[PDB]
Amino acid sequence: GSHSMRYFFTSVSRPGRGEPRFIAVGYVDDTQFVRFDSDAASQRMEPRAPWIEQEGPEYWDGETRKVKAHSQTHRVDLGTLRGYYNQSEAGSHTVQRMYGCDVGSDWRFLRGYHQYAYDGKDYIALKEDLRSWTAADMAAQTTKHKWEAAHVAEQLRAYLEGTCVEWLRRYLENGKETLQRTDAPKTHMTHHAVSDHEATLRCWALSFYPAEITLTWQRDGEDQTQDTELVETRPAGDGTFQKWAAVVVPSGQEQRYTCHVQHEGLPKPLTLRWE
């Protein structure tokens, strides 16, 4: 019954092709609810879930003002990081920021986070105490010194423990039909010969929410993790998720193999069998 609110920012430079493109998205759990795209015509924070549409004009104006301000700072950051790393303008670079808060089943604060990456690598992250920073290299130590002297952590901690949690709870209530639901996976296994002597066994989970799930194969009760092909959990497009796991086995041995599904929607974990 645990929940999260997260915001994700990506800014990408495009040398000699204009200013950087900035995209921001916001999620409650695995449900997107807002977006902003600096290239788009509207120049507005836009709704992406039905339950956020009821927020009033002060909300949309304020969310737009804040995200535009972040768009500009991440533009400046791409410049700053080229300076920190002595990089040229021959190539494109990427800054990412992610932040948000988690609450438990009882909706009380669990933990907060705020992390930044440059070119796909950790750059600087707020520690669990929300008071101190982890800087991944020497350039990020420069940022750490500046953020310590500017008391950035204190600002974030007040947001993460306060405002973040309060608005997460508001969204959970307003979007309760979507966000408080659990859709248990509909499960089955498929069998297809790959030759006269081997078969692919594929364990499916469909139509589930939230996206967290575990699918595993056992052979006589022993986990077959090195022999399993496990695909990334994927969106169906309707607010639910899908996932599969496959093993290739000698024909005749199917009854040794079982698939095991764990999900919060299931009253008990399922074991699927070939007998």
Binding site: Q96, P235, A236
Partner: protein, 100 residues
């Protein structure tokens, strides 16, 4: 610089039934940097008006996008997704296999 290859999956929203409207998805995940070309193909031709999700990323900083279109499967029509990215030396085509 870090580069991570897209993991490409092509699939329908619902179990396919010929003559019944559905959605064809191409989900690309796990990639870096974010610049990526994704097309859905019907009988080898690019499908126009394909929509996509807003750019987002996972705990490990790698990106994901869903490209999708409404479609009605038939016996004869072949569907695929074509993806290009800096990590791919040529565009990669994954065929929709409805019997997985």
């Amino acid at each position: 610089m870090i580069q991570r290859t897209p993991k490409i999956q092509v699939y329908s929203r619902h179990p396919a039934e010929n003559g019944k409207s559905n959605f064809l998805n191409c989900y690309v995940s796990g990639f870096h940097p974010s610049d990526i070309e994704v097309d859905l193909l019907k009988n080898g031709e690019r499908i126009e008006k394909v929509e996509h999700s807003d750019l987002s990323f996972s705990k490990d900083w790698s990106f994901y996008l869903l490209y999708y279109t409404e479609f009605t499967p038939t016996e004869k029509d072949e569907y695929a997704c074509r993806v290009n990215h800096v990590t791919l030396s040529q565009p990669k085509i994954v065929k929709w296999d409805r019997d997985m």
